């Protein structure tokens, strides 16, 4: 289904990377945050919900969505309840940037634009077709 996203945290250079994957397309969005936190999770989900039609969200760590503040965000937005590929691309471009967050955003761009249509294309098409 086009409304299903996966959301997980990974660690790199002592920082946290929140990664969201649109399961049907392989499209990703990601952000660097100081540490795993219900507030960070909540605010990311607000941002995500505001650009795409997010219906459900899965994770690999159920306890991530336990906090009151994450549930409140899912309520308001009407939400219900790739590390290796991305980590790879970050290594290739890490040299070209100072900050990890910049390398993340470069990799996310590399990821979504690559062809096999690109992930970035498939999300748009899948979502348009389902309108």
Please give the Cα distance from 8 to 30 (Å, whole number): 10
CB atoms within 10 A of CB 4: 14
Task: Identify residues 62-91 at the interface with a copy of itself (CB under 8 A).
Answer: 76-77
Helix, strand or coil, per DSSP, at residue 44: helix
Q: Which of 28, 69, 67, 66 is nearest to 46 (CA)?
A: 69
Q: Which residue lies nearer to a copy of itself by CB, 63 or 129?
A: 129
User: Which listed residue (12, 24, 46, 82) binds a copy of itself by CB under 8 A?
Assistant: 46
User: Which listed residue (17, 19, 20, 49) binds a copy of itself by CB under 8 A?
Assistant: 49
Using rule CB under 5 A, residue 13 touches Mg ion = no
DSSP at 65: G
Q: Would you state the structure tokens that stand for residue 92, as one six-digit string?
A: 């290739």
User: Which of Mg ion, ligand 9VK, a copy of itself, none interacts with 69 (beta carbon under 5 to 8 A by kind)?
Assistant: ligand 9VK
Helix, strand or coil, per DSSP, at residue 11: strand
**Which residues lie near a copy of itself (CB under 8 A)?**
27, 29, 43, 46-47, 49-53, 76-77, 101-102, 105-106, 108-109, 112, 117, 120-121, 124-125, 127-129, 131
């Amino acid at each position: 289904s086009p409304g299903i996203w996966q959301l997980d945290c990974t660690h790199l250079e002592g920082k946290v990377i929140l990664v969201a994957v649109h399961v049907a397309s392989g499209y990703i969005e990601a952000e660097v945050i100081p540490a795993e936190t219900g507030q960070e999770t909540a605010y990311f989900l607000l941002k995500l919900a505001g650009r795409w039609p997010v219906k459900t969200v899965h994770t690999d760590n159920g306890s991530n969505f336990t906090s009151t503040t994450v549930k409140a965000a899912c309520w308001w937005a009407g939400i219900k309840q790739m590390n290796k590929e991305l980590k790879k691309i970050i290594g290739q471009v890490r040299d070209q940037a100072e900050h990890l967050k910049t390398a993340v955003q470069m990799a996310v761009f590399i990821h979504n634009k690559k062809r096999k249509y690109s992930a970035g294309e498939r999300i748009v098409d899948i979502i348009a077709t389902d309108i």
